[PDB]
Design an enzyme around this catalytic site. Structure first.
Site, PDB file in Angstrom:
ATOM      1  N   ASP A 184       0.828  -1.205   0.000  1.00 39.87           N
ATOM      2  CA  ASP A 184       0.000   0.000   0.000  1.00 39.87           C
ATOM      3  C   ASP A 184       0.869   1.265   0.000  1.00 39.87           C
ATOM      4  O   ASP A 184       0.747   2.136   0.864  1.00 39.87           O
ATOM      5  CB  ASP A 184      -0.950  -0.019   1.205  1.00 39.87           C
ATOM      6  CG  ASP A 184      -2.149   0.910   1.034  1.00 39.87           C
ATOM      7  OD1 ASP A 184      -2.974   0.989   1.975  1.00 39.87           O
ATOM      8  OD2 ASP A 184      -2.357   1.593   0.004  1.00 39.87           O
TER       9      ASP A 184
ATOM     10  N   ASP B   1      -6.525  -9.492   5.726  1.00 39.45           N
ATOM     11  CA  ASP B   1      -7.718 -10.296   5.433  1.00 39.45           C
ATOM     12  C   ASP B   1      -9.003  -9.692   5.988  1.00 39.45           C
ATOM     13  O   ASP B   1     -10.040  -9.718   5.328  1.00 39.45           O
ATOM     14  CB  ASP B   1      -7.571 -11.719   5.997  1.00 39.45           C
ATOM     15  CG  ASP B   1      -6.418 -12.490   5.378  1.00 39.45           C
ATOM     16  OD1 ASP B   1      -5.899 -12.072   4.319  1.00 39.45           O
ATOM     17  OD2 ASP B   1      -5.965 -13.534   5.890  1.00 39.45           O
TER      18      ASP B   1
END
Ligand SMILES: Nc1ncnc2c1ncn2[C@@H]1O[C@H](COP(=O)(O)OP(=O)(O)OP(=O)(O)O)[C@@H](O)[C@H]1O
Ligand SMILES: O=C(NOCCO)c1ccc2[nH]ncc2c1Nc1ccc(I)cc1F
Ligand SMILES: [Mg+2]
Length: 289
Positions: free
Chosen positions: A130, A157
């Site tokens: 990211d 997740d």
């Protein structure tokens, strides 16, 4: 010392972004000012103990190019990550005020991102996942640091998008991605900060003269995977910087430059040598020191 919810006190709100909000807080027992990221997760109590257990590796994530970690815990429906307060904020914030970030300044930023990715890869075997302006933080001592990288696998997740994607073509097209995807993200971030706006779609010749509606989601992602990658515009930037981002933005991830190669690139060697008062430029543009 262990961190806990009632030991804190909100000073202000540093901002928000898709999942968590982060607060400038005072840890009463230590006296320290920190940045407390809260992430709302409606999640079972077994796996929220695993998230905290896996975030404990951030105690060994010590680097001048990585945001410091104080501790993590679970409160009432939210997991708290407590980190170094960076008083200059994120690079997306400084880009709003600055208009553009000078090329010499982006040399110092590029160095910091490469060295931070390299630290995370070599010492901890993890990729960021990211990389973008908002996850590159700066302070008034002139330090440039990465945050919001993917240490705990379980945390990724539990949060599994936005109108602007820094994801590589290969990651957009499926699960066939890894560390090379971070290179693409950095490259796009650098073109963005250099030009003053998100570089997809590319600006026409008339929009480049003025500097020197928004795309739909599918239209934008289709451009990333099927249309040629964004270039740094010729003339106003040096040839070595143009080559740097071009190597970062090669669609094919195996053909694309990796961290090793970028470290010894002509643009980095040149920026290593340069004398830049980054602290002085940063405070000058956002009004702090
Ligand atoms: N450690 C910190 N010190 C000072 N400011 C911070 C810190 N961490 C985050 N911020 C600020 O809070 C804002 C929100 O951060 P957050 O990670 O929640 O979302 P974002 O990265 O800005 O956007 P997105 O969720 O889409 O990635 C950032 O833009 C940044 O300016
Ligand atoms: O905050 C995350 N994303 O930003 C979206 C929030 O709206 C984020 C996401 C996935 C993650 N896995 N492990 C950690 C982690 C993480 N935080 C994080 C990592 C390192 C530091 I130093 C500080 C952090 F806060
Ligand atoms: Mg973030």
């Amino acid at each position: 010392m262990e961190l806990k919810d009632d030991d804190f006190e909100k000073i202000s709100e540093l901002g928000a972004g898709n999942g968590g909000v982060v607060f400038k807080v005072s840890h009463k027992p230590s006296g320290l000012v920190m940045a407390r990221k809260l992430i709302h997760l409606e999640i079972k109590p077994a796996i929220r103990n695993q998230i905290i257990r896996e975030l404990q590796v951030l105690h060994e994530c010590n680097s001048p190019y990585i945001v410091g970690f104080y501790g993590a815990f679970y409160s009432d429906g939210e997991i708290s990550i407590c980190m170094e307060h960076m008083d200059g904020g994120s690079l997306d914030q400084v880009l709003k005020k600055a208009g553009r970030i000078p090329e010499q300044i982006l040399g110092k930023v590029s160095i910091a991102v490469i060295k931070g990715l390299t630290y995370l890869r070599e010492k901890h075997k993890i990729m960021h996942r990211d990389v973008k302006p908002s996850n590159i933080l700066v302070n008034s001592r002139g330090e440039i640091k990465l945050c919001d990288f993917g240490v705990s696998g379980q945390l990724i997740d539990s949060m599994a998008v936005g109108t602007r994607s820094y994801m590589s073509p290969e990651r957009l097209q499926g699960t066939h991605y890894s560390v090379q995807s971070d290179i693409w993200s950095m490259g796009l971030s650098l073109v963005e900060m250099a030009v003053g706006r998100y570089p997809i779609p590319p600006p026409d010749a008339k929009e480049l003269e003025l500097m020197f509606p928004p795309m739909a989601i599918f239209e934008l992602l289709d451009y990333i995977v099927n249309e040629p990658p964004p270039k740094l515009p010729s003339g106003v930037f040096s040839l070595e910087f143009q080559d740097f981002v071009n190597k970062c933005l090669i669609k094919n991830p195996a053909e694309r430059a990796d961290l090793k190669q970028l470290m010894v690139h002509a643009f980095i060697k040149r920026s290593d040598a340069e004398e830049v008062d980054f602290a002085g430029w940063l405070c000058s543009t956002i009004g702090l020191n």
